[PDB]
């Protein structure tokens, strides 16, 4: 279950965040920790496509090789806080699992600048029981978390020492697919 009402960044700049580019997850914290593996790869693109607010997601378990992409149109709850109904797709946007009620995530941008961000998500998927997931993002897939984003982790009353890094997993990403999936 999720337990946090994440607070969006004061003065969040939506056009800068949703600029069509890619964000890589460098570090994550799930508050139900046995909900996700301890070794993982994830990234997203975020942008407006023909007037519609979109994200494209990529997940990869580097041990099992389990791989999936998703596309969503985000709905606005408030600035920096969204509800996203997702469809599982191949890398080319062909639908594998259609949008369905009950398959959605919330998405809150707690901090962002041009290069780094801190987000919260709460996934809802069928009858699964899932927890709060925080992720540190960077534009550069190899970037160590800087003091701006680490300060934001502290300001969220979290300990960055708790976060698990994705950097030692040899993660390789198809940026081209993420960007193109925004239109799908």
Residue ranges of the binding site for heme: 59
Size of the site for ligand HEM (CB under 6 A): 22
Q: The tokens of 14 are what?
A: 């939506």
Nearer of residues 29 and 49 to ligand HEM, judged by Cβ: 29
Nearer of residues 70 and 132 to ligand HEM, judged by Cβ: 70
> Strand, coil or helix: what is 20?
strand
Query: b/e per residue, 145-160, with b = 16+ CB within 10 A?
Result: beeebbebbeebebeb
Binding-site member from 22, 44, 122, 136 for ligand HEM (CB under 6 A)? 44
CA-CA distance, 142 to 136, in Å (whole number)? 12
14 near ligand HEM (CB under 6 A)? no
70 near ligand HEM (CB under 6 A)? yes
139 near ligand HEM (CB under 6 A)? no
What value, to the nearest 5°, has the Cα angle with vertex 51 and ends 45 and 55?
A: 20
95 near ligand HEM (CB under 6 A)? no
> Which segment (3-11, 34-42, 142-150, 154-162) binds ligand HEM by CB under 6 A?
34-42
Q: How far is CA 17 from the centre of its chain?
A: 12
123 near ligand HEM (CB under 6 A)? yes
């Amino acid at each position: 279950a999720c337990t946090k009402n994440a607070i969006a960044q004061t003065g969040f700049n939506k056009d800068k965040y949703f600029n069509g580019d890619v964000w890589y997850v460098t570090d994550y914290l799930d508050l139900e920790p046995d909900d996700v593996p301890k070794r993982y790869c994830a990234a997203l693109a975020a942008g407006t496509a023909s007037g519609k607010l979109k994200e494209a997601l990529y997940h990869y378990d580097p041990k099992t090789q389990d791989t999936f992409y998703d596309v969503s149109e985000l709905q606005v709850e408030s600035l920096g806080k969204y509800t996203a109904n997702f469809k599982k797709v191949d890398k080319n946007g062909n639908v594998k699992v259609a949008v369905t009620a009950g398959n959605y995530y919330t998405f809150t941008v707690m901090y962002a600048d041009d290069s780094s961000a801190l987000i919260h998500t709460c996934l809802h998927k069928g009858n699964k029981d899932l927890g709060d997931l925080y992720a540190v993002l960077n534009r550069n897939k190899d970037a160590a978390a800087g003091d701006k984003v680490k300060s934001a982790v502290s300001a969220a009353t979290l300990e960055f020492s708790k976060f698990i890094s994705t950097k030692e997993n040899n993660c390789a990403y198809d940026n081209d697919s993420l960007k193109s999936l925004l239109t799908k």
